[PDB]
Ligand binder design. Structure first.
Ligand SMILES: CC(C)=CCOc1cc(NC(=S)c2ccoc2C)ccc1Cl
Lengths: 531, 405
């Protein structure tokens, strides 16, 4: 078991050890457990106790072709976050050999802070609740108890420090019950070192596994298959059927949504459409022709092998971004052409009002943030925007914005500015003085204008809001005016526009105005206080 | 010996997440930490400790050597009080201030062995390939409010000699920093500082009198267009929130009719007296604005564009304690975030220099943009508070007006 310094565990604030009643079992489940516990009892994992323990946890007996600590846990203090973020292939380095040792029941190999052991008391029942039951407790980290994964890692970490000091050129990854160990040594020296480590472990009681259970390359990590020279994307399989329920259609869209990252072209517009007005998860929705098709158009793509290469510190890091459509972006991070480490895309973030350059700025930062985690470095960007468009925009925008070292790449569609409000009133251009008003309660409004050239109009609106009339007024202005227009309004929202000049909004109306603005040759927006 | 520090009643330790760091940054931190560990300043910790404060690295204007900086903002806020030194209202008057980093003097003092757990911090591993390296403090941390406190006597104790050697010089202490101001000319100044260090060392350029909180100036022209006036009216109208004596009635009359935005309108004598009367009101800071010590200090910033930024420090809306304009520094030409953080460090130092406490900032940047790269250009020992906001189109048009030489 272990000569390992225990970790001092405590219960949450002022709470106290579990006292749940021992679930009753058959003569067959009892004699089963009676068997396994006299075993552990001897291995040095559990310890027969008596009436000197008020605490008790419910032991069950399942046959695999078990103790419920739920409560003990909900009373156990909080530990540090047992590593929650895991490596990503795109950040792994190629290795000559990579062995994975299975420190399975290494749990029952680590001592449990003596004092705390009591709280882990449980009882074996008697044939139909007869005389006293068999009572025990844990001397080691309990499979399923809150503090065991953290305490295990801590341990494994302390134990490896010596070995790791002893051979830097040997990377050892700690994860769950596995010790994924790799190196750049010759298969022989590697094989030799694995046995050395294996034995070091053994020197502390961790009886590392046989050949039968033995694990080897490739390895399934997240959605990939890992090979020491490179990785491949675990081929995804779309089921075929004559009956699609809702769940069936969702779990699918999910899988597909995941693929969208790696695999380019995947679509689920027509597939998502089948969820409209769904009454129950089990409902059976016949697939439209369009859905039957796209589903078929994907199956193909997914039948494409996508292999990848590992991270090479001696080489540069590059990121190219493509605007797949409005608000959607595709990116691929490679060090050497067509040999990508990672790729992925960003769903049409549907804001309230922004523009392409800003949206580009966010994709760029979501990436940078990603990159820094995976590589502790940030990629050089190749962006479909002219350096002029950039300077022109950013330099003036009202908000701190920025883009790390980047370089333009003429890979259309290139992102640009759809329009630019004139910086100064247009001489010559007609001047529309607009006004919209509505009764917010009766939702009845009117919108219209009058120009310095004597042109006027007014439309009566119903089921509208005031902002809508204010904006409609402006829409009409752009509609009835020529290629160059001046527009003065007391609209607070129109003021948000002159300052942000959005090219996409949550408001269809705003969108229409945008389509109008994009159409003029010159537009000057002037805001003025009301009344 | 150690003094018993504690947490404000019913408060628990910080459990703030360590944001990802650059390799360069991690290498240095690891390098830096194995040392302090050696020197016994810090000690690796166990999983039974769940608190955590973020950390990062910076090049304190003069380096190659990275400096370790921790964000105890949470801890500080959760740490009991000790009810520093009363603010020398006279410091802001000195002809020149020079700042000194004296957090180095804290490792000397041992931290209450029962408060250490709360000082736990983590050094991340790239690609989560390794579990973070968990440490905690055994001595006094730099950046923690309890440090300059506990080390007060010791500190006050060592400066008297110098204080008694120059009394025309003020020594102010904030966090890890030391603000030193005097009126001696430059040479006789910086020679009096290096002289100060020497002393400071055998153990372990600001000019406040130039800070002319400037006025608002309205545009003057030969001829004014309909648009010219409208813009002015707007600005004034807004400005009326500060100076209620401001009036745009007579001007809002010249604005009768649907004439071309570009057409020219002749100013009636009335609209002229009126304007002239407004020019007067804007001639001096509004009456009755007084700093409240039992109220938070606010610093709102605006991106005027073209490397320019403006700021206002108040406590109550429209009741500004100071106003300023910041122009980017040579080098930050294409970096909005660098310009911004340099701006913020400046304002916070001015704030400290005048009121001896940091202001809570209101920033014109997205949380994401900010959090991603601010540490890249931070150079101060302390970290002020902030929130991200959307600049009202008017507030900018108005302050963009402030005067210049
Ligand atoms: C995280 C993980 C799945 C590790 C084992 O798989 C591999 C990891 C690497 N490269 C590295 S840097 C490595 C070796 C041991 O632990 C790590 C994190 C390469 C190929 C495979 Cl097959």
């Amino acid at each position: 078991i272990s000569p390992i310094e225990t970790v001092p565990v405590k219960l949450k604030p002022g709470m106290d050890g579990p006292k749940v009643k021992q679930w009753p079992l058959t003569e067959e489940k009892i004699k089963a457990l009676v068997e396994i516990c006299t075993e552990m009892e001897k291995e040095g994992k559990i310890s027969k106790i008596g009436p000197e323990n008020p605490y008790n946890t419910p032991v069950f007996a399942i046959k695999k072709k078990l103790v419920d600590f739920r409560e003990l846990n909900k009373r156990t203090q909080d530990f540090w976050e047992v590593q929650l973020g895991i490596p990503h292939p795109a950040g792994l380095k190629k290795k000559k050999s990579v062995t994975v040792l299975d420190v399975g029941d290494a749990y029952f190999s680590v001592p449990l802070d003596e004092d705390f052991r009591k709280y882990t008391a449980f009882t074996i029942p008697s044939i139909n609740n007869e005389t006293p039951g068999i009572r025990y407790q844990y001397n080691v980290l309990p499979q399923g108890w809150k503090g065991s994964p953290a305490i295990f890692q801590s341990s494994m970490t302390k134990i490896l420090e010596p070995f790791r000091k002893q051979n830097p050129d040997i990377v050892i990854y700690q994860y769950m019950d596995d010790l994924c160990v790799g190196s750049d040594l010759e298969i022989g020296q590697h094989r030799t070192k694995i046995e050395e480590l294996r034995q070091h472990l053994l020197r502390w009681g961790l009886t590392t596994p046989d050949k039968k259970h033995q694990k080897e390359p490739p390895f399934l990590w997240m959605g990939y298959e890992l090979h020491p020279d490179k990785w491949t994307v675990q081929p995804i399989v779309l089921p075929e059927k004559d009956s699609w329920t809702v769940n069936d259609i969702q779990k699918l869209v999910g899988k597909l949504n995941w693929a969208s990252q790696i695999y380019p072209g995947i679509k689920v517009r027509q597939l998502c459409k089948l969820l409209r007005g769904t009454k129950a998860l089990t409902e059976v929705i016949p697939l439209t022709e369009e859905a039957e098709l796209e589903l078929a158009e994907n199956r193909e793509i997914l039948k494409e092998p996508v292999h990848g290469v590992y991270y090479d510190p001696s080489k540069d890091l590059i990121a190219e971004i493509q605007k797949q459509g409005q608000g959607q972006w595709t990116y691929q991070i490679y060090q050497e052409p067509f040999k990508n480490l990672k790729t992925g895309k960003y769903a049409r973030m549907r804001g309230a009002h922004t523009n392409d350059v800003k949206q580009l700025t966010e994709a760029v930062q979501k990436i940078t943030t990603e990159s820094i985690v995976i590589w502790g470095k940030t990629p050089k960007f190749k962006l479909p925007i002219q350096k002029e468009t950039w300077e022109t925009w950013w330099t003036e925008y009202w908000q701190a914005t920025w883009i790390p070292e980047w370089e333009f790449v003429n890979t259309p569609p290139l992102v640009k500015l759809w329009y630019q409000l004139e910086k100064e009133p247009i001489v010559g251009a007609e001047t529309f003085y607009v006004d919209g008003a509505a009764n917010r309660e009766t939702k009845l409004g009117k919108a219209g204008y009058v120009t310095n050239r004597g042109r006027q109009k007014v439309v009566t609106l119903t089921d509208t809001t005031n902002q809508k009339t204010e904006l409609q007024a402006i829409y009409l202005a752009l509609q009835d005016s020529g290629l160059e227009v001046n527009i003065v309004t007391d609209s607070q929202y129109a003021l948000g526009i002159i300052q942000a000049q959005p090219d996409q909004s949550e408001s269809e109306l705003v969108n229409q105005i945008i389509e109008q603005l994009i159409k003029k040759e010159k537009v000057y927006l002037a805001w003025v206080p009301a009344h | 010996e150690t003094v018993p520090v504690k947490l404000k009643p019913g408060m628990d330790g910080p459990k703030v997440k360590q944001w990802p760091l650059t390799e360069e940054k991690i290498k240095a931190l690891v390098e830096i930490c194995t040392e302090m560990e050696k020197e016994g300043k810090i000690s690796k910790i166990g999983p039974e400790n769940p608190y955590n404060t973020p950390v990062f690295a910076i090049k304190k204007k003069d380096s190659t050597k990275w400096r370790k900086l921790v964000d105890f903002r949470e801890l500080n806020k959760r740490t009991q009080d000790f009810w520093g030194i009363p603010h020398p209202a006279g410091l802001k008057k000195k002809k020149s201030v020079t700042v000194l980093d004296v957090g180095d003097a804290y490792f000397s003092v041992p931290l209450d062995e029962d408060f250490r757990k709360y000082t736990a911090f983590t050094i991340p591993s790239i690609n989560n390939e390794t579990p973070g390296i968990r440490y905690q403090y055994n001595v006094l941390p730099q950046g923690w409010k309890g440090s300059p406190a506990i080390f007060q006597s010791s500190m006050t104790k060592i400066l008297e000699p110098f204080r008694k050697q120059n009394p025309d010089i003020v020594i102010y202490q904030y966090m890890d920093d030391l603000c030193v101001g005097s009126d001696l000319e430059i040479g006789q100044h910086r020679t009096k500082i290096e002289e100060l260090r020497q002393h400071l060392l055998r153990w372990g350029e600001l000019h406040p009198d130039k800070w002319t909180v400037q006025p608002i100036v309205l545009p003057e022209k030969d001829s004014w267009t309909v648009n010219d006036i409208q813009k002015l009216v707007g600005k004034l109208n807004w400005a009326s929130q500060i100076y209620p004596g401001i009036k745009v009635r007579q001007l809002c009359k010249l604005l009768r009719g649907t004439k071309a935005l570009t057409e020219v309108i002749p100013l009636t004598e009335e609209a002229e007296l009126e304007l002239a009367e407004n020019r007067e009101i804007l001639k001096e800071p509004v009456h009755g604005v007084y700093y409240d010590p039992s109220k938070d200090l606010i610093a709102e910033i605006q991106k005027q564009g073209q490397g320019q930024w403006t700021y206002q420090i108040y406590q109550e809306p429209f009741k500004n304690l100071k106003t300023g304009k910041y122009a980017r520094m040579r080098g930050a030409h294409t970096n909005d975030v660098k310009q911004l953080t340099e701006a913020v460090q400046k304002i916070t130092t001015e704030s400290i220099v005048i009121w001896g406490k940091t202001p809570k900032f209101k920033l014109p940047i997205q949380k994401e943009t900010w959090e991603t790269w601010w540490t890249e250009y931070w150079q101060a020992t302390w970290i002020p508070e902030w929130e991200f906001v959307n600049t009202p189109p008017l507030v900018k048009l108005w302050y963009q007006l402030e005067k210049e030489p």
